[PDB]
């Protein structure tokens, strides 16, 4: 039970945590870059759109750029962030 904390690659066991400032689930990381959990992943991890944290396995990642000021991620315009799909550890 050891987790990656930055430079997430496919196959990494990761810690998925609720981020209330951004009102989404994110990968726990020491990097300043935001790794949002892809919304497709929520049922697979039994998270609804209150559980504080879960372990997951990274399976896909996507590099994105906010193109409007108000967005579902609550990040400023132009911000660049990742979207990650993850499944349950075991």
């Amino acid at each position: 039970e050891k987790i990656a904390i930055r430079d997430f690659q496919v196959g990494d066991l990761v810690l998925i945590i609720l981020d209330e400032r951004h009102d989404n689930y994110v990968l726990f990381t020491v990097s300043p870059t935001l790794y949002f959990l892809h919304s497709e992943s929520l049922p697979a991890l039994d998270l609804k759109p209150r559980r504080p944290w879960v372990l997951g396995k990274v399976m896909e990642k996507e590099y994105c750029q906010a193109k409007k000021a108000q967005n579902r991620f609550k990040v400023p315009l132009g911000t660049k962030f990742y979207r990650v799909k993850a499944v349950s550890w075991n």
Binding site: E62, Y63, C64, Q65, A66, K67, K68, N71, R72, F73, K80
Partner: peptide, 9 residues
């Protein structure tokens, strides 16, 4: 959405 686009690192 048009909120965000995929971009190459």
């Amino acid at each position: 959405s048009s909120e965000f686009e995929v971009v190459t690192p």
